[PDB]
Design a protein around this ligand. Structure first.
Ligand SMILES: O=S(=O)(O)[C@]1(CNC2CCCCC2)C[C@@H](O)[C@@H](O)C1
Length: 658
């Protein structure tokens, strides 16, 4: 239908604009849609974009508002003191502020639907909340409404929540337009989505983006497809991938690089309230933290990720057990059979399950997919699904049979409840992935696996050497292959922290010379250097001019292919903030050839200092643009859990950064 009111080019300069005479008598019926295109690149801490209120003395709590915070949160209040109603619905990290240093036009759509008693908010094509209520309050049914205001709410005759920004366009409709109609509203987004709710992964959440540019010109991305909210393992998480063959303009429908099937892939709206938000899928196996490299010699693409058995994450993984048994210089995966309280079995050659107590082979084998066979016959288990129908998280069998896998809760034979690293390869640049294989233990029998550093591995330019950084207590542990990923050895580099999440990414400064940038516990990004292709490593130094929080955040890093100001250049991506995971920047450093020192010369603001920016991936696209896929929210904050469609992709040119 047609708008009952439409207006535009409203400048909000800490002075409200009264539109009462234009709008109030046009409002009718119980359902309404507001469509607002607006900018706010210097917002106040809390500000109202749009207000309908009773402005009379004695009725300060009778109003409807669409408000935003300088954190990027968007929300509404719907209040009527006579009815005893005070609704407040919002979602953090819903907005853009600036892109390439210019204010972004956000497109907000708020649907107030009396028929389903639901209030739904979209920003920039993304649904950020959908809230159904017992007693519906139509936004124009508030007792004694007499003002319609832009850039404030009029309470008792005074301007509250004054806004700084602009409303380029605003329209109101006396109808709750459908989700289908919402999708037809034109957008001006500075970003793209590669992975998103409702896509082929069926995950409602995503974290831990990666990007890597392949020799064909194809750009490949991997990600955690996270089903049980944005929680780290334990949860259900798969690793998914997507690629672009046109310099990031379009992306393929995702497929899985690593997946378990003990739990259903369910798209779930995870609870965000303070009683239930920590609900966590507790009986599922998962993968977490992926990393990609391409091997020039073989042509293979290689992806590693951590693997977690059912119920396991980094917090409860057995730190004192690799899950492997060393027998005459060889490592064998240990297994525990139901009924035993110890690990009496090993997986030997050809997947044969061997009884360590009697030294006899059993009638069981493990196939290449870590599935259990008995006398050659595939065993199955019943799949679980999850729901909150009872008012709390429930995990229960769903009637479907899936292959029995040793990483599963219901398996007859189970692996050690600790963390592992697996690798898969692709021979067609991400169009399909092989079944994963566990990497061997690197730090002996009685040590849990190291933790993969998400992002990119490093292919050295002048050899066949492949390196993936990992971390554990007290060190970075580099995994090195010179044979296309068939075998690996470790190279340990001490760092002066205990129990740091030392997520590390590497650049080759020149032939044989690797610099690694990594997260610390000190508020500063650290680095170390190898001058022998990863065999040995220097002591740790720190980067000045970038601030992180005490807990830190992953940093991504690349060596740019072209000179900048006549110098070789390194680009870092990281939040730059002492408060939270916000204020994302790309930082361009120019290398001094005399000593390999780096002058951090340019700092590019991805968005506002107050807007969220957490884990990130960066890669030089084949056309020398820079692609950035990043978590546009504070992934640490306990207030910003379980947000959909906040991992976002942007395209930048070097001139934008400098
Ligand atoms: O030099 S590589 O390490 O092979 C790599 C790709 N280089 C091309 C060179 C030509 C322009 C695009 C980037 C950089 C890493 O960040 C990965 O994207 C892989």
């Amino acid at each position: 239908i047609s708008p009952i009111f439409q207006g535009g080019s409203y400048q909000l300069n800490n002075k409200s604009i009264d539109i009462s005479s234009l709008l109030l008598d046009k409002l009718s019926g119980e359902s309404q849609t507001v469509v607002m295109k607006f900018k706010a690149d210097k917002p106040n801490s809390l500000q109202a974009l749009f207000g309908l209120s009773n402005s009379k003395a004695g009725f300060k709590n009778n109003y409807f508002s669409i408000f935003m915070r300088d954190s990027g949160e968007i929300g509404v209040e719907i209040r009527d003191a006579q009815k005893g109603i005070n609704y407040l619905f919002s979602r953090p990290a819903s907005l853009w502020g600036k892109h390439k240093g210019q204010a972004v036009e956000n497109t907000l759509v708020f649907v107030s639907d009396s028929k389903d008693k639901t209030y739904t908010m979209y920003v920039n094509g993304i649904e950020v909340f959908s809230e159904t209520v017992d007693t519906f309050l139509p936004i124009s049914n508030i007792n004694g409404i007499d003002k319609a205001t832009l850039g404030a709410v009029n309470r008792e005759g005074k301007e509250h929540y004054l806004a700084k920004g602009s409303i380029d366009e605003i329209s109101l409709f006396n109808k709750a337009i459908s989700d289908q109609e919402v999708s037809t509203i034109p957008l001006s987004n500075p970003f793209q989505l590669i992975f998103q709710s409702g896509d082929s992964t069926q995950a409602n959440y995503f974290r831990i983006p990666t990007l890597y540019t392949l020799s064909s010109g194809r750009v490949l991305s991997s990600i955690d497809a996270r089903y049980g909210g944005t929680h780290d393992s334990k949860s259900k998480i798969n690793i998914a991938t997507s690629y672009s063959d046109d310099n990031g303009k379009t992306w393929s429908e995702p497929i899985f690089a690593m997946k378990f099937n003990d739990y259903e892939e369910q798209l779930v709206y995870w609870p965000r309230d303070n009683k239930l938000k920590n609900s966590q899928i507790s009986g599922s196996a998962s993968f977490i933290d992926s990393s990609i490299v391409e091997d020039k010699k073989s042509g293979k693409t290689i992806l590693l990720a951590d693997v977690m058995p059912a119920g396991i994450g980094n917090n409860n993984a057995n730190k004192a057990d690799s899950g492997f048994k060393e027998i005459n210089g060889h490592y064998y995966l240990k297994l525990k059979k139901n009924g035993d309280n110890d690990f009496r079995y090993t997986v030997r050659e050809n997947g044969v399950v061997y009884n360590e107590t009697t030294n006899k082979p059993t009638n069981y084998t493990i196939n290449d997919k870590y599935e259990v066979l008995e006398g050659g016959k595939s065993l199955t288990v019943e799949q679980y699904s999850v729901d909150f129908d009872s008012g709390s998280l429930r995990e229960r069998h769903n009637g479907k049979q899936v292959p029995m896998n040793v990483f599963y809760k219901d398996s007859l034979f189970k692996v050690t409840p600790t963390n592992y690293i697996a690798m898969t390869t692709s021979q067609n640049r991400g169009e399909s992935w092989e079944q994963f294989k566990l990497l061997p233990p690197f730090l002996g029998e009685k040590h849990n696996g190291t933790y993969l550093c998400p992002g990119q591995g490093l292919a050295l330019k002048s050899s066949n050497r492949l390196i993936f950084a990992t971390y554990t207590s007290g060190e970075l542990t580099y995994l090195i292959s010179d044979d296309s990923g068939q075998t690996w050895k470790k190279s340990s580099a001490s760092i002066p922290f205990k129990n740091a999440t030392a997520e590390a990414q590497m650049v080759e400064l020149r032939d044989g010379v690797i610099r690694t940038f990594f997260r610390t516990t000190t508020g500063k990004i650290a680095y170390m250097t190898s001058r022998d292709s990863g065999e040995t490593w220097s002591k740790v130094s720190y980067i000045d001019g970038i601030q992180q929080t005490s807990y830190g955040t992953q940093v991504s890093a690349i060596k740019y292919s072209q000179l900048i100001d006549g110098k070789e250049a390194v680009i870092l991506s990281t939040p730059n903030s002492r408060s939270g995971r916000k204020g994302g920047q790309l930082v361009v450093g120019l290398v001094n050839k005399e000593d390999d020192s780096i002058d951090w010369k340019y700092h590019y603001g991805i968005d506002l200092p107050s807007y969220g920016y957490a884990y990130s991936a960066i890669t030089e696209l084949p056309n020398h643009h820079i692609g950035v896929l990043f978590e546009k929210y504070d992934s640490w904050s306990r207030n910003e859990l379980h947000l959909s469609n906040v991992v976002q992709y942007i395209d930048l040119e070097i001139n934008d950064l400098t």
